[PDB]
C-alpha cells in the first residue's frame, strides 16, 4: 500500500483509522545509504542503513531523526490525516488508549529508543510549539541514548505488557527549551513485544510536575494534538545508522 524511500508523509488508513506515516530525518544536513518505510494494510515497518550522517543543526544537540507514524494533527507539519478526532483540549480527554505491537532492532552502539509522544499547544492549530507549550514523550524502550534536560522526579504508572498488568517505574526528565519539554522513560526498556497504556496516566502526571511552572499556564486547557510512534536515533558524534522495526496490531481508544 505505502512504500517510501526518502524523507516524506503519506496518510493511509489501518483497521478503519486514519493515520500518516513520515519517514521523518529531521535533523540529518544529508546521507549516503538507504532508508525504506512500509506499510501493506496489516503492518508498517522501517529499515535504515544510511552513511554520511552530521546534525542538521549542530549547536542544538540531540537527535538526528525520528521515522514514525501518528494519529492526529503534528503542529510543526501543519498536518493531519482526514478524519481524525484530534485535536480535544486536555481537560475533555477522559481517556486515550494506545495499543501496539513492537519488535525493534538495532547495531549495538546506536543512539536510539522506542518513544510516543504528544504536543500540547494553546491553540488548536498552530505550525510550531513555543513558550506554554508541551512536548510530552513516552520512552519504552532506549539504547545509550538519556532524554533532554534532567531528570527531576519518579512516576508508577501501569500498563499492560505482553497481556499482563505491570506497574512501570518511569523517570521524568524535563528541559525548558522553546518549549517544555517532558520526557519519562521505562526504567526496564522493552525491546520487543506489546504494550497498552492510557496516556491520560501520562498527562496526569506532567500536569503534577508542571503546577508550579512560570513557562506552562492552565495546562487542562492546552490542546491534545496528536500521538506519534516511533524512533528517534542517532547524537551529534553518529556517522552512520543501521536498525529498524516492525509495528502491528495498532489500535487507538479515544473517549472525550
Known sequence: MVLMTKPGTSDFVWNGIPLSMELNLWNIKEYSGSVAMKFDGEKITFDADIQNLSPKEPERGGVLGYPEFYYGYKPWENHTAEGSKLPVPVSSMKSFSVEVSFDIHHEPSLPLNFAMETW????????????????????????????????????TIPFVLNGESVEGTWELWLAEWGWDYLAFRLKDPVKKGRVKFDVRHFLDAAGKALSSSARVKDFEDL????????????????????????????????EV
Do not use: C, H
Not at 514523550?137 to 512516576?155: A, D, H, Q, R, S
Not at 553518529?238 to 516492525?246: C, D, H
Open 223 to 254: 490542546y491534545f494534538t496528536v500521538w506519534e510512534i516511533g524512533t528517534e536515533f542517532g547524537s551529534p558524534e553518529t556517522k552512520s545508522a543501521q536498525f529498524g522495526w516492525k509495528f502491528e496490531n495498532f489500535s487507538i481508544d479515544l
Open 120 to 155: 500540547l499547544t494553546r491553540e488548536k492549530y498552530q505550525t510550531e510549539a513555543s513558550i506554554g507549550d508541551v512536548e510530552i514523550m513516552v520512552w519504552f524502550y532506549f539504547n545509550n541514548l538519556t532524554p533532554g534536560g534532567e531528570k527531576i522526579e519518579e512516576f
